[PDB]
Subunit: 244 residues, 4 copies
Amino acid sequence: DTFERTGPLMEASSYPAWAQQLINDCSPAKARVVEHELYQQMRDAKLSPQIMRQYLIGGWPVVEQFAVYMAKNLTKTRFGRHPGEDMARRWLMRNIRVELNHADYWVNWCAAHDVTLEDLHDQRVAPELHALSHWCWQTSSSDSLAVAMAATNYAIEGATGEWSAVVCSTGVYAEAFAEETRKKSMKWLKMHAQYDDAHPWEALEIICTLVGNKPSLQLQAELRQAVTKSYDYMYLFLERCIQL
Amino acid sequence: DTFERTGPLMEASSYPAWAQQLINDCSPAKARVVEHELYQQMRDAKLSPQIMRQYLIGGWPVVEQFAVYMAKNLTKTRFGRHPGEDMARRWLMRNIRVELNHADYWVNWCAAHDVTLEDLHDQRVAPELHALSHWCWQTSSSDSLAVAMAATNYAIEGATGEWSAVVCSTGVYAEAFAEETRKKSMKWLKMHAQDAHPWEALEIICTLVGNKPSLQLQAELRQAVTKSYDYMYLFLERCIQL
Amino acid sequence: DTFERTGPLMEASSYPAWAQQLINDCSPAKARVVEHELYQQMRDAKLSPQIMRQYLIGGWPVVEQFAVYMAKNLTKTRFGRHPGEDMARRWLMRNIRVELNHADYWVNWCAAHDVTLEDLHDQRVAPELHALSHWCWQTSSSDSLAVAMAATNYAIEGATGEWSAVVCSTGVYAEAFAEETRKKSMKWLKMHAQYDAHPWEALEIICTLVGNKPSLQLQAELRQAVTKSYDYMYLFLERCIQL
Amino acid sequence: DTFERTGPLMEASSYPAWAQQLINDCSPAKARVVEHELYQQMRDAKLSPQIMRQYLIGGWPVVEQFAVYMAKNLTKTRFGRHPGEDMARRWLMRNIRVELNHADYWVNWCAAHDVTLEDLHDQRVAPELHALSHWCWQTSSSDSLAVAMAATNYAIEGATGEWSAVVCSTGVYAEAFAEETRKKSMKWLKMHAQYDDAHPWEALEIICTLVGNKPSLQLQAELRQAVTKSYDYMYLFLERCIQL
């Protein structure tokens, strides 16, 4: 049967029971990322420039290609075919524009840590760190619109908002930068920490409208595995950086 | 060598000599479309509802997928690789958002002529009319960024702006609609007549190819632009045959 | 419900009723192509070198990219997902190899009519003639495996076999070529006229994928895809003969 | 300038200096995979069924989609455009047919270790093991013909031939299976180990013909990074199975 949200957008209770189950099943994998030691050290301006460097260089591929993932998912949509598809169409068209200067913001954050655009092109980091980007590519290329959006717009942007909030929570990290260049350097983190917390809930609403209230157990497992894969690749990336 | 625009954006004289030559070479093919009898009849509210119906239904595939072409072209870009690529990246990201309600505007124009969304899905028109959309798909899928933009954002949107202006030029066509629904029905045409969009695309194409592109690339660019105009002309000829 | 062919491969009666209905519904569009004046003139070695030239140059894009259309279709398959998908997997992997020298054969046929490989690259022909290739591209890129194969492997290869047979039916066209270079020049036509199971295998794969009771909406897509391929062929022929 | 092979196909000395340099630079990464402890244990029929299970399930995605990677590469070719492109066109068309029963052979090997086709679909393994398949997808999708063949036909197949030979080298592993079903179970390994050791050399020749004798340092680095990434993801997969 068809899903239509009745309750408030940012309450798990407003979504179908299978979706609530998915949120609970994937919560430990999300926690591993959000509560990670790396972000706690970064927050407190105690994170080694060696780790910071690997983080900033390795993190670039997903940052650079985010709108390309979204553009690939948009090519899956058709007008007036399904209500979920029409929501996805509109939302992806709106949010591709939002990502406009995000790559430039990352380059600016990098510059504050003496990471050049040339460093971002060269990608002289452990291949392990590129796994998330390859996964984002494949899902947005070949998986269903719902599975693909669960993996990228829901899982990545959801976790990103939570850990960037952790990193900005004390103000210690920001105080470590010069007053004059602070705004420019902290821009990428401020956008993701001070951006509508509704964002992943909008994504989840679209996913549920696409799959409906009674999806197959096979589709449920595919959705659970896609979300978990994104969180797990994010955790493995963090673990690899902290190993240095 | 590298291209950098000096002169005003909407003057042919501001672009490399090969581009000016391309504009002159493709101008008769553009004229066949813009000066077409169909738009002159539509302008004067003298176009048969039979032709109008085929036009509205057949025209839907390019309208519906226009943002999908731009999305496909965006996937060809990478950050900080080339100045032309960085312009294309930004421009495509901005203009995908611009096409948000364009499909809804087309559905609204259709509704004024009793063409339903179901009619648009069914596509019970001559397959000839779908050729432009198939060309758009292929070029934006497999051709270089410059070539694909030359055929879509430059050729299609360029010609579209010119013929929609012709259609709106007298006010006769708008007066034919009911006062109550007039604004809603005329919206798609009004959005396209009211244009720097084709010129911005030329600038990107020129920054991508440079001042001295290969003769093979020049021919590919000329053929792509001509193919878009020619498919538009053949679409118009097919509609007027009914 | 699931489809399993019991009857002979090359009889319409061996397929589901909806498929038989599709064959009858698309037969007039196929006939326009196969029974076309161009092939009748070519068969009798009476076709103007001017038309022959446009034909050979314009026909190149679909010939050159036919295995690419298959390769794109193969990317839509997964192992052990569906019986129809497993048949498509195997069949496309086998038939991509079959198309190996087909482009070289076309270049050789072209040479006999003073059409160079440079001519094929330049594509100095009416843009109308490229419509089939653009359609093949889109359907093999974005349509479902069944719809895409119906438009390429079924409709194109099916019609191609029938009109190449018409062209070779008298022996007049072959006799027009020099004895010494005849075999090399006639190779592309020989490979499509003398080789007729390919479209049936494609029809079998399509019916196995969609089953015995496909939706009316899916049936209509299948019908439209097959008709579009035949109609673009017909328009290509009409454009050629106008010259 | 244009490359044309003069010397024997299976000698590094027959290829341009940059290609010889690439072979030497990627040899340690290839060695980590081929000389891996997992294959040595498997060869001697001493590998834990727990590890063997993860191996067989996790290895399935690249095996299942190998022909799809090649098919994607074939779509990048055009006839009579470049000599290297014409060689690639022919070679991919021939070798897609070769992969016909390879997935069925893997399913048969899996059956001998009580791994069902359902297990292969479910993929209830560590997400780390899927990284090679995601990389294979992305490269075959968005990288150049040369870079994607270097990563798949050259790197993956080249290493596969070498480690499958290691696994079959003693006969101990084969003797561990029942006489009656041995041929059916060992088929995937036997096909890869017995295959003309010249297949990656065929691929290396095409890559060299595509890029020429004087490719840019940027293209050389791209080729080196692609080959290394494939070997590294292979190594990480092996390390993950052996951890269990």
